[model samples]
Target: GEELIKENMHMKLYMEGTVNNHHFKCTTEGEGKPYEGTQTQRIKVVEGGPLPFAFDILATCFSKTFINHTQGIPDFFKQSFPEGFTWERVTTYEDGGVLTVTQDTSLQDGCLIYNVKLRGVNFPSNGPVMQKKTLGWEATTETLYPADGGLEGRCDMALKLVGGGHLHCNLKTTYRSKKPAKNLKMPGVYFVDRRLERIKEADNETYVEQHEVAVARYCDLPSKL
Candidate 1:
């Protein structure tokens, strides 16, 4: 008899933070706001697999917004996907003596795409101690047909990252949804929780202005999920 391994959905995130003094400005006059300050994120995974898989493999980062005060704070994010996401090891690559692993899998209502890179420095007499770094990303989409309101559509955060060593890379997420909230949460308020007094004090006075610029290589990730 063949055993059925139910599918499940899961998300893993990676981030690197850099300090930029100009990031606190109120205008976009000069070079504009460079990526700076506390950088972090959260992931929501809804159950799609028949049985629970490896939720422990997930990762995240947090950043300080005008609404909250934190630096790459861990475990402050959520993942809400149907239960059917599975993990599959894809290939391996070596860059600057660093080994990288790539994985590709599909989720119930979403998809899982990630890559992990590891390397070791400073060797004692024995084998060199190895350090592990992971870079993961994901995307989710939904379709809806309304009885009277025409057709509905939803999308999830299309995420990607490039990081290694003590260096963490930046990730830019773009999302679109028909019901608005259905596709993804508001990016400007992703980590902003107004209920908390600290959040209110930190973010209340600060404002984030939005702008669209020409797409560049390292500036943006691919459009497809």
Candidate 2:
């Protein structure tokens, strides 16, 4: 019989879920136009063991505005160019999970990128039980938002989880924003542009909550006959 190290016990399952929302007001100096927009996205697992899983997403947008405090924008124009524009929410949901496996490295420029390669023993769930390998790359830019008091960044990633679990996917995201909140123990206001400001809101209104959980498992391989 031959014993195998825990590292050699390579079979595993991975699952993830995420939701993201953004709200902001954009106003160009010369233009007396004020635009407010909100976006929300969600993603969840559906089925399967390791490779294939069912997933779906839904998104919507709405807005209303008046010009120069006098002329009201028509519904046609408003709908066509609503203050609340849904900019690629579905894409955002898909990328959220994919980014986790690829965002393994961080750069000095506040950018994070990774090139990941994973091997699976019986990857392609349905086809056949065979060894497989895959490689991929990911890139992301850090952005700060003072108004929101948090840290946020945009990310783009591509993956080819090949071998038995071989899968190919690509994702891109930009204009990500975040701000520092009391809940995270990050003080003051920071913007993506590298600007800092003092928190003006009261203590009760300034703090925000953040929670996360992760699990991992490993075991030594038994003796082989």
Candidate 3:
């Protein structure tokens, strides 16, 4: 049998889920060449409370083995983003405010690790205020495709508010492939399970919620094979 090095692919996916009664929708699409690809993702809160929450993420992916390197080299400290990579969120809740994010991403062992440092600028106080208006945060997200090599995978996220709060999120996904239509193929099936927790260290207050989600994805080959 002839060895196949790589095949061009186009992928798209969508997800709808609820966590703690907060409903949300997510959609992603991308194209892959022999060694690199670009993708964009959007997440929107559909039926959530405490205002609105949404995110836009754009990224570029590279193969770890593309460069000559020792197999034992650690991947954690290696991070890079695409020239146009960007991430931002929109919200009007009590926790909403101006913010800055430092991002790190790693593609290793068939898994993607996303790490971020989040800083928030609080509203200015009027008078006799000593409290600082800055908030700190750290978040980590992981996505993996199992060894079974099926069209299913999972993504998990953990976020900590430096002042003493934390949140965790989980997403389960399945991509049901479809016949090619033009340059795209759509996956019309998916199942997602999301669990979330909000914890405050000072008062030992914790809120936990679970949700089941369904989403779809699509893929397209931008260039003819």
Candidate 4:
């Protein structure tokens, strides 16, 4: 638990030292794990930004769920088929390097879409179908490898964070684009829990929430850059 016990909020968000204004508390629990917390203090993790960027930053993400209401698209309660639709528009790039799929799994103005529109999305190259582009950032984010035509050697840093509870661990990734790089070695990772909350009285209940680093260089991807 040496790595998991590191005490630092900045290390947990992995955003360098940006956005350190939120106040919260921490606690300890479990083996191979050291901390956790739930702040009823003051935060909702909902209602946020669908970041704005100047270039076409195309990258994909897998998240639990979240929302933001001001991207100006639509409000959650009003749209075509309110419960939201799964009509995924999958646009495949010809050489079939990468695929871009536009989907609206909800309708709140679609406005409440936490819409992680990939402002600082991953890329060995940017435009949905991978290519080779040089990047210079090393913080928390997703990444595609250029040496493999952005096919294999993919890595991502994640925090499926919530306003007061939730987390994850032990992830390994591979690409459908290549089988040759299948043997590419992956990094050994662990989380530093700045907080945790035991939901439900006695259920061996646990969560390894938020921490930072690597597979960096996700945001600065674009042809013009």
Clashes of each: 34, 18, 8, 13
lDDT tens digits, residue span 60-79, model 1: 11111111223432111111
| lDDT, candidates in the order shown | 0.21, 0.20, 0.26, 0.22
Residues 131-190, candidate 2, lDDT per residue (tens digit)? 213232222122222223322323232333445332333323211112112222322222
**Cα lDDT tens digits for candidate 3, 149-172:** 123445544334335554333434
TM-score, predicted candidate 1 vs. hidden true structure: 0.17
lDDT of 1: 0.21
Question: Which regions of candidate 2 fall more than 4 Å away from where they truly are?
Answer: 1-47, 53-134, 160-225
**How accurate locally is residue 60 in candidate 2, as Cα lDDT from 0 to 100?**
10
Q: Candidate 4's C-alpha lDDT? A: 0.22
lDDT order of candidates, top first: 3, 4, 1, 2
Q: TM-score for model 3?
A: 0.25
Index of the highest-lDDT prediction: 3
TM-score of each: 0.17, 0.21, 0.25, 0.19
Error of 3 at 86 (Å): 24
- Best to worst by TM-score, what's the order? 3, 2, 4, 1
Off by over 4 Å in 4: 1-81, 100-102, 107-111, 114-225
